[PDB]
């Protein structure tokens, strides 16, 4: 004889997809038509990125908690990264099981750098397709921190609805999979997510017979505590 995460472990890692479509009637909540299109698109996208995909459908709040604790209890030592995709109803800081809410913080805390040791120092990606409130965008014209190496890719800005098309699937996941497919062999992940932002911002606008919900816009929200650049191709 180091600005990029080491991505040449023998496995890229797990990609957990939680696909909630049908709600218990007592919740008063409605179904999420189009979400199966999202989950299949996601399965195929991360398969090509060489992630071991596990799809889970219609999980209660206790099933979501149990699943994530279990997955965080696995030995990830031969994996480069961890990906969890949440497709559901939600509001700010919260995603819904089929029978009630789960705090996003309770989910992600299982993977803290001190609680999931085989993922310490490795990128932990949470992709969240869910509302974060009820605002509508009308548009115009030695040690490391335990919260380090998380990336949260939210579908929408804080406080806002997130949009889903009943036959094409959600705006964000649509755009995410398309940008991953076109650019994962070319761009660093932040720059890919920036393309996702532009795609959603420019190419989608809501159509509704209800004037309150018509002609509305969306911008996704990248939240990064990453300490290095993330590439899906290597050498």
């Amino acid at each position: 004889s180091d600005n990029s995460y080491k991505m040449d472990y023998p496995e890229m890692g797990l990609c957990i997809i939680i696909n909630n479509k049908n709600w218990h009637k007592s919740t008063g909540m409605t179904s999420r038509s189009g979400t199966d299109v999202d989950a299949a698109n996601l399965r195929e996208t991360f398969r090509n990125l060489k992630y071991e995909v596990r799809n889970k459908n219609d999980l209660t709040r206790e099933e979501i908690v149990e699943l994530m604790r279990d997955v965080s209890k696995e030995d990830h030592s031969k994996r480069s990264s961890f990906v969890c995709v949440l497709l559901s109803h939600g509001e700010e800081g919260i995603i819904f099981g089929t029978n009630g809410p789960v705090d996003l913080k309770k989910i992600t805390n299982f993977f803290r750098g001190d609680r999931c040791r085989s993922l310490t120092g490795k990128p932990k990606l949470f992709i969240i397709q869910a509302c974060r409130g009820t605002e509508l965008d009308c548009g115009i014209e030695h040690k490391i921190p335990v919260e380090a190496d998380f990336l949260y890719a939210y579908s929408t800005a804080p406080g806002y609805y997130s949009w889903r098309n009943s036959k094409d699937g959600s705006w964000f996941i649509q755009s995410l999979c398309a940008m991953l497919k076109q650019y994962a062999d070319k761009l660093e992940f932040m720059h890919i997510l920036t393309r996702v932002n532009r795609k959603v911002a420019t190419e989608f606008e809501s159509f509704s017979f209800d004037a309150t919900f018509h002609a509305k816009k969306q911008i996704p929200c990248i939240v990064s505590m990453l300490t290095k650049e993330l590439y899906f191709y290597h050498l």
């Binding site: 939600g90 509302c131 949009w163 889903r164 098309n165």
Partner: peptide
Amino acid sequence: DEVD
């Protein structure tokens, strides 16, 4: 188009 629907909201989540």
